[model samples]
Target: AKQFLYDNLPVVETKAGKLRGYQWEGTYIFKGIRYARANRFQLPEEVEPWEGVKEAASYGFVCPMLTRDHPQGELLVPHRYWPQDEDCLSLNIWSQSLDRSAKKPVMFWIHGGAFSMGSSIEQKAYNGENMSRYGDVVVVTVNHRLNILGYLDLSPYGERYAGSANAGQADLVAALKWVRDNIEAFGGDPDNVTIFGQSGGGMKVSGLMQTPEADGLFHRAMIMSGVAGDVLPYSTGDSRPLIQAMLKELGLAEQEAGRLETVPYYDLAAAYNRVSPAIARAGGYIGCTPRPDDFYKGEGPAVGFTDHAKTIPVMVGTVFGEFAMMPLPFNKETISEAELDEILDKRFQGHGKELKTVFAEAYPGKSPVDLLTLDTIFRGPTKEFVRSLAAAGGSVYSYLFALEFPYQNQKTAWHCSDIPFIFHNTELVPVTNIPEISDKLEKQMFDAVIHFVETGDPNHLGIPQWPVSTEDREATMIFDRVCTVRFNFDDYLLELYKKAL
Candidate 1:
């Protein structure tokens, strides 16, 4: 007899509720499953249990809203309708087994949208429908609130939720707690979970490594083209001014701002858009730069919570030509040296000579614009974070995604080229075709990630041994058309950022 979707694989009851899953080949997939307490903003609580097999195939409703129109790029698979309601809290799982007989390592994914957009369904990378064919790990991808919806600070009026910020981060904590409790039933070892994300999602991973609330949720991390700077939260002094100004523009008194709490979501979005600065300055994740005072303002904090120096094992790197991905004047026909010097002066701030001297040493006759891009964007924080973490006796693995593919205007690897490879979904990326060497490198990075997840180290058995970052200098895995392991690639620039820090 032919079987229906429900008949092939049935739902299983857990402490949270009932979730139905289907098995394809050796993999069993459970989609749109609730893991955390529902309604985090207004009312925070775990979801009550439900009955029957809820098919876990397709993705659930994403955040309240997500857009695709962008000067750089748009959403790959655009969402037809918008997301509504607080039931947006959900998780997706793909595993080699469903019987809970074999315990497998778990890989939890976080989506990136500049703290603005992105959903679990938007995960063009790590489609896991095929990656699981090579690695026998139980994978989990989650969706949480983002952008103004997630980070909007509405605590200024009447002071109910005062002193609280980054509600989206709070929701992530709840979801990881859910995974900690329920992943065992899905044949996953929650103890062995590795949390990885790209872009803004990668920022989430970096922030999570520092957040005390997310401790023990994940053991390993992979960050691509993202930074912890993206997750900077606003204190009353910093973000309050911005929100109050927004309220002032809306003709509401500072005391009357809370009246807008019950206002519709889209209306609130319009308010934020109106308040964002019109400056063309380029920096940070959000329009606003993160201040160190935001997190360190608390009294008597744990040492390692804010700085992830000796805490989590991580593989963090950015693309080769990240600036080209921006609408910057990379293809400028004619530009004055004065205009270029202004841009360089902005990032270099007070130490222009030392910065130039150190950069010139590393790049050795690189152009002013290219040198500025690497110094300001790519190399500074990476080199500093490596030294900081290594000083704390933590192991760090570094890489440079220098692979340049055909059919792209940007020279070298553009922003997010490493994502398809890290998730082993190189074929699914439509913008660029995966070459043969890309296939080989993708497999190598994937295996390294898997090994990192299983153990603290990213090295594999038969593959080339990758040494960890040292105190004096860093050892980096260079991913070009063919892979190479080298040091001092940018030694002079590394010296500059270290001194600046």
Candidate 2:
């Protein structure tokens, strides 16, 4: 039986009311679709409710679906199933009711696609339907612009959208503004909000934490599998300079700004594709990590992200094998182990013997080729984020999602395997690609996430006695089929990575 503030299959009122989101099991879901604002995609506006019952069974239109496949980043195999419309500025809401009295803690989710692609459509992992049922929290997932459309350093072109290197970020601010004004109608409390994301989504959260516009919109944040400053570091080793170089090669250095609109989106995307390594650089944008000398001199986009964590209760960590999948074969796989040794010999040159001990201590039996990849990609950048946040005097929690399911080969629990489990949506996904769910671990991890959202503490009764990650303890949750709390599961690896960073 369906229910609402108004009865009898008719429209229910909102700010612009008279429509109803379908009742699922017992929850009423309201999807604000075609919710357009900004004459041309700067921010959004409150959706005027439509007449008759609005279907809540599906997600709204997805942003343009451009797949970012790689050896490093592929947790979300992009499926361009939804319609692409500029009116795609919409939100999906899952809540216990559509009344002010039932106001629940609000969770605003930003999905990840390397800031290039992804949508608010509930994947099996991110569905907020059951989250509302279990935790009494209203969940909202969103889809904003992506790729050149969303972020293309447009300020250089004209005054219309100056200082807009981050239009996608601007869209997020608009969405938060909408949530502030209207979430109450969906039974969500406007006052208590948590913004959480994974991968690029975590990067988005990190960016949001920095932006002054998003200041009070969220009280708590969770960043999984994405390091903050490493997304686009500045240096010769970084990718943006290469992207700039490629633009210069094409003789369009000045036109790089607004020319994306004139350059066929595919051509522009192909150029980005020509550069995107979501995998190549070990799960970050190519050259996402920066050299200290280079980074200090505005070597990367990460320069702007400095000290964003100073004012927030921040949690940051990555999946077990975060970098192995997304990027194409570069080091280790592409080069002979001997060749990698030669490159390192050249890099360290005279100090080869001294550095070899440090390298051996960190990597143990690592070959030169694998060490090159580790130093350049995964191990170095991740430790930098952990070290930076810890040194900032901010409350931080770190963990390694160590669970590997049988379905995905011995990929060793590559990135994003934690999302579905954390949300307890084990049964919602397609049977083929999804891993079989373990009920015990599922409940524990789900409990931890919700507790963290509600109280900012992941340690709860059902979860094993867990400790906050600290300088001394470095306590981390080794999330697996059997979840456990451990102090420094791979202290050697962490130290090695720390030194490499």
Candidate 3:
């Protein structure tokens, strides 16, 4: 009935103090529970004790952004907006019960914006109510620092800013610590926590494994649409130079760099937006990818996945068309042979005939129109990362969400398109929803993940027997209208695209 209750609201004791979270029906959700606090360019600190029970019914503020967020992908991916402030180190929890000894598996979500922007509740697909209700697991999402506020390396300033560059990541560690300490009270099993994310969120998940501070805090890890350090390098070029440029742009000297701590949020964000491109052109363009320090080593492959990653069961994946949506003037569904001939010729420079032949066999029963939208950037590297992790004696699984949506007659999965399906909220986003198709696919995908969380393997009765990926056979679980486990299925398609390019 979607009933809501406010009185006698379930109050739980945390390491900080006592707090109350609201309950809706069977799922008890707590929003914006402050886990830690910090000043600008400072590592997160434990929160101070409160007098009485703090109400965590509403979400706390999210970190300030470089620009005011407007409706960008309104139709494709709906967003949830909330208040913003520097004091945005909070987290959300959704559990089936408040029993302190419940010990349910925990799924900690890290939002994706490539470490630049995005809050725990930024996307509709990220809602944990359905996940916690259906999966019978406790779900937690965190909101920490970002961009200049989070990733800016002001360590050159002095000892007060020793870990300035790694503050954002440290904030996440703080959140993980909070969950490790407090999630059990919310029916979560801290020892069996799984960290998962998509897009930039995926990169953060992989990055967390590389971090020593995050060790023992989370057990399993999953990264989607984010792998292959060469293709999607998280952070490059030093941002140290941006410090002087910022103070100078703000009419402050290096000696007065200390004043940046007190500068207004908008002013600081504006100066960053203005001066961010200069160093980018040359080098030392400091961005959100936390600077490699004692805290966080570089990507797993680059710096050698930490010992924790060696044992951690990992999952890496991507979509059929990750940001490869190139719509035709008219629907390809209705395109004639003659039209296809010319369009392919024009787009692929007279490789139409060869492309059509291989694609027809590659994706039997699918239209040749799907050929133009296949992905190469993420797949190749994801394959490399999967096999690479396997090489290190770690158990890993691979997946590709190849479900083609009926949005605008464009039969392809674009970026973030697989999110609702992964979260089992297909009914929420109508554009990506196919009642007959999505329901079946959603259950398979969601159940597979839950199984992976409960155990190390993603294989279950709901889907086919998924094989662990290896160098010899990049065995992949392809999630489509009909799920299948194919060994080296799309290698030919990728090779063809790379040759053409």
> Which of the numbered candidates is closest to the native, going by highest lDDT?
3
TM per prediction: 0.79, 0.72, 0.96
Q: For candidate 2, write residues 1-501 as lDDT tens digits.
A: 544342443244445545556766777776654445432313345566566655544567766544543332224332334676556777788888776877688888888767766777535567777778888889988888766556544333456654334666767877887788777877788887888888788777777776666778877778777663444442233334544643654456655644545555456556666655543555333332212331122311344434544556666667655654444244334576566566666655544445556656533434444333342333235445555556566566766665544433333455566676666666654321334446666777778878887777878776677776654556667666566666654556545444433
Model 3: per-residue Cα lDDT at residue 231: 59
Candidate whose TM-score is highest: 3
Positional deviation of 143 in candidate 2, in angstroms?
Answer: 0.4
lDDT of 1 at 474: 82
Model 1: runs farther than 4 Å from truth? 1-6, 37-43, 65-68, 71-86, 158-163, 228-238, 248-258, 278-309, 326-376, 431-434, 461-463, 493-501
Best-first order by lDDT: 3, 1, 2
- Model 2 spans > 4 angstroms off: 1-18, 32-35, 38-58, 65-80, 228-309, 326-383, 408-411, 430-437, 471-473, 494-501
lDDT of each: 0.63, 0.60, 0.84
Lowest summed lDDT across 10 adjacent residues in model 3 is found at 228-237
Best-first order by TM-score:
3, 1, 2
- Per-residue lDDT of 207-279 in model 3, one digit per residue for the tens? 7888988899999988888874555555555556787888889999879988899999888989988887877
Q: Which runs of model 3 end up more than 4 angstroms from their true locations?
A: 228-231
TM-score of decoy 1: 0.79
